């Protein structure tokens, strides 16, 4: 586990950068190297908020396994969002 | 393109209070799509702010300007 | 008659909000205009709506129609210092 | 000072989506305390922003400036 955090941050960073290029192409901008690093660090940190809420929401329902019900609650204020991620998830 | 299921599972688990907490496959796929949308929205908002200043180069100050509203629209 | 009840509730929120805000004005040496107090009352009214809708969904998540202290603790989950005060404000009640 | 139990009960009941929803007495007293903390935090932050601008009078601009992080902090 010695390198787990570093490996997660790197994987999050390069995927974030790749995803941002789609936006750069669509809007005709260039994201600086520091801007991408900032976005991936915000994402890494926000993922922690998501994870801790999911864990607590499952415990509140007396479960030790997080389910799509807990994700729905996480997205309770973003019904448009929940409905898109559910649609993209079923694109599977 | 998107986050790998393994990345999302390990990322959530790293941040659990208890590492034994489990997450089922459906929830992992929903959370991967959510994080992809979050990244694209952050990038689009920062870009859309840099374009408001007549710039094609998006800098960290642009991220800083849009961050509170980005977080507000997701929580 | 619905709108009479709503207007009275808004007035109750406003005067209590304004009373609380003027304690803060004094400690900081500033003055809140009447429109600043009105803005804070209105934000507080709408934040009660956010709180209510979260409490409702938290209780329903636990398969309850009745909101309990456990759902309020969940509202405070992200601030230990706030959660700590609410948690043992809560435990006074359950002892009586 | 603080919000009356009845005011909080009516406020919450007004905003529930579901007619079945109720609040027990202990939760009502806790929510009155939380709402008072929210008001005090809003007023204190708006006051500090006015002082940062070297102003004695707190204006609605000052509330607008502190509101995003205030809301984020009460998620």
Numbering used by the authors:
A (entry chain A): 9 to 100
B (entry chain D), D (entry chain C): 6 to 80
C (entry chain B): 8 to 103
Authors' account:
FANCM is involved in eukaryotic DNA-damage recognition and activates the Fanconi anemia (FA) pathway through complex formation. MHF is one of the FANCM-associating components and contains a histone-fold DNA-binding domain. The FANCM-associated histone-fold protein (MHF) 1/2 complex (also known as CENP-S/CENP-X) associates with the conserved region of FANCM immediately after the helicase domain to form a FANCM–MHF complex. MHF stabilizes FANCM and promotes its DNA-binding activity.
The purified tripartite complex was crystallized under various conditions and three different crystals were obtained from similar crystallization conditions. Unexpectedly, structure determination revealed that one of the crystals contained the FANCM–MHF complex but that the other two contained the MHF complex without FANCM. The tetrahedral and rod-shaped crystals contained only MHF. The root-mean-square displacement (r.m.s.d.) of the heterodimer region was 0.5–0.6 Å. The structural alignment of the heterotetramer also showed high similarity (r.m.s.d. of 0.8 Å). How FANCM dissociates from MHF was further investigated and it was found that the presence of 2-methyl-2,4-pentanediol (MPD) and an oxidative environment may have promoted its release. However, under these conditions MHF retained its complexed form.
